[PDB]
A paper describes a structure:
The broad substrate specificity and cellular functions of PP2A are controlled by formation of diverse heterotrimeric holoenzymes; each contains a common core enzyme formed by the scaffold (A) and catalytic (C or PP2Ac) subunits and a third variable regulatory subunit from four major families (B/B55/PR55, B’/B56/PR61, B”/PR72, and B”’/Striatin). TIPRL (target of rapamycin (TOR) signaling pathway regulator) is an important PP2A inhibitory protein and forms a complex with PP2Ac together with α431, excluding both scaffold and regulatory subunits. We determined the crystal structures of mouse TIPRL and its complex with the PP2A core enzyme at 2.7 and 3.8 Å, respectively. Structure-guided studies reveal that TIPRL inhibits PP2A by perturbing the phosphatase active site, and together with α4, exhibits a robust activity in disassembly of active PP2A holoenzymes in a highly sensitive methylation-responsive manner.
TIPRL possesses a unique butterfly-shaped protein fold with two extended layers of β-sheets that pack closely and in parallel at the center. Several helical wings (HWs) arch outward to give an overall butterfly-shaped structure. TIPRL structure is very similar between mouse and human 35 and is likely conserved across species due to a high level of sequence similarity.
Numbering used by the authors: 11 to 78, 107 to 139, 145 to 257
Write the structure that this text describes.
Amino acid sequence: SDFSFGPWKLTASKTHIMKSADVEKLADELHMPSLPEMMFGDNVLRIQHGSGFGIEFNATDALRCVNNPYDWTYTTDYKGTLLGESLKLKVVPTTDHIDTEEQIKFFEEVLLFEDELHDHGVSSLSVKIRVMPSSFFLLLRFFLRIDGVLIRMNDTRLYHEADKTYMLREYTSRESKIANLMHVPPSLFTEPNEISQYLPIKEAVCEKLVFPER
């Protein structure tokens, strides 16, 4: 299930969970004791150029950004994997915010991992992309609720418009202790596009991915 638009190539695969002994193997290769219950070690969302350069998302790469007594939450600040050889996107800092304020030509949502934290909450990494006639927008979201104690959300928004020679990658981290949210219905701890807006932004980074020349 793939798509192409002008200079761009979009590859995706949505598979199932890895084998049960298969991950004790990869748990060793990443050097940490446990992997999420549901490990889509084959799912990928990739966007590339006709000059090799581009960026992908997978759960193996994302999990190498979990700290290393370990992080049984699997909180990750992974922001994609750059592609290409001899021609790659360079990461420069910038002032350009992505203010999300237009018709959809293509869309898919790829799930990367999930874990239910021994039935005490949820921990999830997913990615969407909507492609449009003039641009494409993309969102890698880590979500974490621990039942009745806190919620954390790490979003990586990625955006590119046709005749700009750069994309924009915007990282935000939100977090709140749950006992600090007065009068929010419990359904909202399960709707992450709803609650996102009522949590404090702890961190925010804004880079610009300048393209190679020729």
